[PDB]
Kojibiose phosphorylase (gut metagenome), 1503 residues
Amino acid sequence: IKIPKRYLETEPYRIVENNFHPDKSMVSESIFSLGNEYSGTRAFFDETYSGKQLIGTYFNGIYEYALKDTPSAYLGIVKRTHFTINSVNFFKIRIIHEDEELDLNKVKFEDFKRILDLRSGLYQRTFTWLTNQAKIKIIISRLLDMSDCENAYQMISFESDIDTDIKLELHLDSNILHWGSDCYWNRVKEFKIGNSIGLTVKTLTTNQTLTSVMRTNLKEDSYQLNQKEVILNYELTLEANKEKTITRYVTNIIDKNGNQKLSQQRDIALTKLKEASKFSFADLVKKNQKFFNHFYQKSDILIDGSDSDQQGIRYCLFQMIQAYHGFDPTNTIGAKGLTGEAYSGHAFWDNETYCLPFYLYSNQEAAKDLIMFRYNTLEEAKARAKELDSIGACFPVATRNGKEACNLWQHASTQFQPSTGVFYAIYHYMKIYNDHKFMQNYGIEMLVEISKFLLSRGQYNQDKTKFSFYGVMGPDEFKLMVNHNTYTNFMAKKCFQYLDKILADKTYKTDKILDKCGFTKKDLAKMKDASRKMVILYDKETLLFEQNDGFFDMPHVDIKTIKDEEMPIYSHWSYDRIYRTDIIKQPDVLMFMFLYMEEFSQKQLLANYNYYEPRTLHESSLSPSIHSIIASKIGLEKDANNFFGFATRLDLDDYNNNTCEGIHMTSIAAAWMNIVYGFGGLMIKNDILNLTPTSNKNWNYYQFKITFKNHLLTVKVDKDNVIITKKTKNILPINVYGKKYELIDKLEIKR
Amino acid sequence: MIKIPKRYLETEPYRIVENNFHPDKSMVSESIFSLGNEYSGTRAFFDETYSGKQLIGTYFNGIYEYALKDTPSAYLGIVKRTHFTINSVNFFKIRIIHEDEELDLNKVKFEDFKRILDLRSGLYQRTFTWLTNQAKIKIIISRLLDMSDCENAYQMISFESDIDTDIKLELHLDSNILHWGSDCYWNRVKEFKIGNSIGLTVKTLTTNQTLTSVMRTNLKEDSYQLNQKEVILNYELTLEANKEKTITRYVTNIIDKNGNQKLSQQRDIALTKLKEASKFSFADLVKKNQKFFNHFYQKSDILIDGSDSDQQGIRYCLFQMIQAYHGFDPTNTIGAKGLTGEAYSGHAFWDNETYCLPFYLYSNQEAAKDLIMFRYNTLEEAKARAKELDSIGACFPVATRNGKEACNLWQHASTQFQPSTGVFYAIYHYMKIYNDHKFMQNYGIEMLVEISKFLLSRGQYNQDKTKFSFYGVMGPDEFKLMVNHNTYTNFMAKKCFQYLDKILADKTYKTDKILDKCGFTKKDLAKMKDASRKMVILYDKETLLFEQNDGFFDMPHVDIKTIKDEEMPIYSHWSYDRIYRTDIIKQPDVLMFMFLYMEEFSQKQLLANYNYYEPRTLHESSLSPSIHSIIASKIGLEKDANNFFGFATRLDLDDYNNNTCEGIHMTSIAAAWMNIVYGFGGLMIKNDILNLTPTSNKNWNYYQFKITFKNHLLTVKVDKDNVIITKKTKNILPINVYGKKYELIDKLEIKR
């Protein structure tokens, strides 16, 4: 049983820390993180702080390899992981008063307040420095520009109760360490040109370059050009109870590929910086708010009867919007977004099978770009297939640059959920948008390459009457080197049948794509044969899928017999023990059933839920929400509510005790999923939007917003009524409690 | 693929000879010409400075260190710190200088080089002529490890100059030696000179182990040095033209593997034995070693007529088996490369119990019993290992010298219980040859209860508890990982349960204080009976096949004949996971338990399983060819039997694996004897009666082997027309030959 550590104020539209909690230093850094997909910054202190901290600034796709190989005698095992790297700290300052440096870990201060405005991404930290004979009220404000994402803005104000002098230094610091251990940047240039100062830096080996420039609305008293560091010095005189303020403008221009002439990069960065400096910080808060107002009109969720859950869901939506908005078809979502170092800014199968749906119903360009990230890493997926003695495209378990970054053969050599996950993403995207051009130009190539991998890594049995995957692991990582994992075989067959439907569709031109992929008539015949002979362990009488061959007959352990002194499992059990029971980590059978809920009857879902849920430890960000969604679909209301539990609060109240490392991106997407797919009962079936709304015992009502076929729908669910509204004039047919209505303006349906 | 001979050594029946120095075989020769007396071993590294590629290697059985740093793991039951037998004092080290030119065969001019290992004495002799300035100096360097008083080593150095000249000779004890070519695993204690004796005392970094090395000679030195962890005797010699000048070095090494020996007593014991040893000439110590080898050749020598190559090989193999172990110490064991190198860390594997033991069972009861006592004396380590695997009782490790798991690959160390059933089988095999009541009462029963406790705790019931098995395991076939119902595992476990059951029901044994001390209750015995009865055994009464593991038969088929040579070895050419998801087998798994229990399986059972598993078997391990040869012989497949024998006696001499540079292959050496006596000889004990079914090696006119059963030293000669069996004992031994029961008194002459 996990517990909340409630230390933050509950407001509907803001996260507020009342007083500084030093014990929550890194938790606060994670939670108050700013992000515009292109870049992100932990809520680390601008000024020197000598306590526990993780300074983190990241650019989506700016990465390095491990400094040395982990050796291996064996092929297909990763010798060199890679990770999104700590980049220039462009919020860094130093404040000195009468030889006393501001450092909230050593100095005396009061009335400390930390604010994240979910309406604007305004991050405001306020405190009163008791320094010698002065009370100095300091307010430091920051923004990442949501539209012009290369830009960040900082405002600093001082108000002394007496006349006094201070020194403010503004730094661009590219000497930052990653893994708290090494700097992954080499110097190229530092420069001051007119009122603008900046550096150009380059990664150790990935051939990536970054130029960071700043300028302010105040003439500096001096400046410094050091190695990978530039500083503007201000000698400021404060009049008693007169506010002195400065605004810092930052532009960061990255080249992720390494072909950009650095003189163009410098000129681009300086042009954009100059343009941005023409606006007040107050007007750039408004610019950010207008961006957030569009995304709240498309997707905001109202919860009545829980101030706690209202803040949590709106915080989750804010962090989903910060993680991704379709800025770059070569960007993806990390397991912690850009909010820390743990999980290396890596994409996992979670992006396609859990994060994608939020984007499908809010932002077509976002959803499309998450799939284009994978298109644009096809070549790495093909190289990875060759590392597994296969052909086609094997999408990796963990990656930013497209190559396998997971150095555990137990997962990297056995789990093809990322490959069928990219298939699923394309399928889901086409179910929502039917984007003929994406499928013609990108989707067919991707489906053919993935199919080629599954056809080469899949094998016929001894006598060639069956096709399956041998030596695999499904989503449930407590089963290693099993045969006939139903998730693996089912999703591979779905891919085969989807590719086969697309190649038979004559509105698509396939001859050059199949020729380019090396996909022949023999291949197509093998693919049809492999689809027909795929082992699916399914029983017509019990309605059960068997998770893998031999699963039902495994030694039984009742999860209720596992003590608290014994968790997590990997910390108290011998490594091998967890594999040789019927304890499941997360949805496996229930995963493919979630992904294809519309093809399973009430009784199939009930039968599989009743076998598998009681055997599931829920040791995954993915598990509770999936179980809640299935529970709601089969009318198990108590299970549905219990699994939802603290879905909106996991980071805010640090239920996992590791929010210090960064936010939990999949758990955040899960909260939206649990509300809309779970309580909402959202399903697209025969190209018609279906709702089956059920209650959360804790809420008087909830309301969500989704777009289908260019109709922005509002769905409000209370004890008595489902209220569905839209503003378009034309009929959208919708299914509610399995009956068909024609939505024009409003439908009120009695429960 | 097909392995080829690199034949560079002369063929003689009683010696290994290198004619001329082969620089490219430098480390191969070091391995092949290794001396060992179980207590200690030395590689055949050059005594003088050698600046070519070499592995200097002196080891003491059970003198070991841990890795300097932990390999980190977030998981439990995975080894964080391996251990290994450490390079120790180099006590053969010399330096020779003539007119400021140092003897080093990688630099100097030399001619008429000859290297000799005499298989009848263990005399290791190197002769060469040093062409230095105006002088030709014939150098002979001779050495011995004492096979009886195993603390002692001897070295003799002679010089013969064609002109009057002066040379300098330095004798070193050097304990600054590296292991893994990186680090010295010894700390200084003391260097000392007491009378005509000079020596050092050193201690291991961590393991609380100490050694005293002392030397003295038959010549007053001109000077000496005591440096940190090395002592030197300096000799300023004047050579008279055509007059041989010889010196003899006596060495005594006293070790404390446990750490409770007072170092003043260690030193005094070392000096007392060094002194006693110094009374004997080198020539008399060669005769002493020959007296020891004559005894072992009278017990076990094998004659081969029609193949000088096989005659040399088999006698070389017997020589290394006698060097590896002779019952010197019940805390000593056989390493995978004996004491001939660093690779495999002087570690014991399940091979000791299931492959190496039988040679000792038929030649030397004290050696056979000591191999099992090594395991009795590492019971506590095996119990800690069972706990690391969330089990109870004793889980004997995959790889160890000190009793702790040294294998850091969970894929083997967490999955393979062949070492635990291997100790069970050794106890059983030992009792089957010697029926040693006192061994079983004082030791055996305890070991069997502890192993059974582990098997019953790591073993689990299936979902509805109608079946018992091992889940998430690996059998001897390492190409099958995290399988269920591995037949070797279940079969051998069931055999352990039934043996303990039968020993507990033998009222000539007192099984009260032992079961109590082990915590083995009437309730554990009821579980053991129920697990024994419900044990999953995938056996088809129609086909007579065992299925290697659940789902084995239905796996994707790969025909081994389609694997190209460019793809060998597999681990270097195939993606890590790929070998696991085929029906390609590394080594005997089903055929392993069928071999260990050949007496219970019919001709038809062996042929059905042989026909299914032999053609799926890659024969990777040095373990595989001999087992298949033995089973092939048993079922009348003479061509297969002879093909699988192949180069069995030559694997190290002609370096078929291309890694004899690292050390000799101990299991491969044992397997040659096994292939001859279990294979061609058809040796088998059934209902306590010795059986023979002698068949022909196509390449041999005759072969002859010697074995001891029920205190009868038996000689078995097999030619084309006759089996002749002889002994000198006066009493009747019943013996079964070609399925007929004779009473052997002095001589049996049986037509074929």
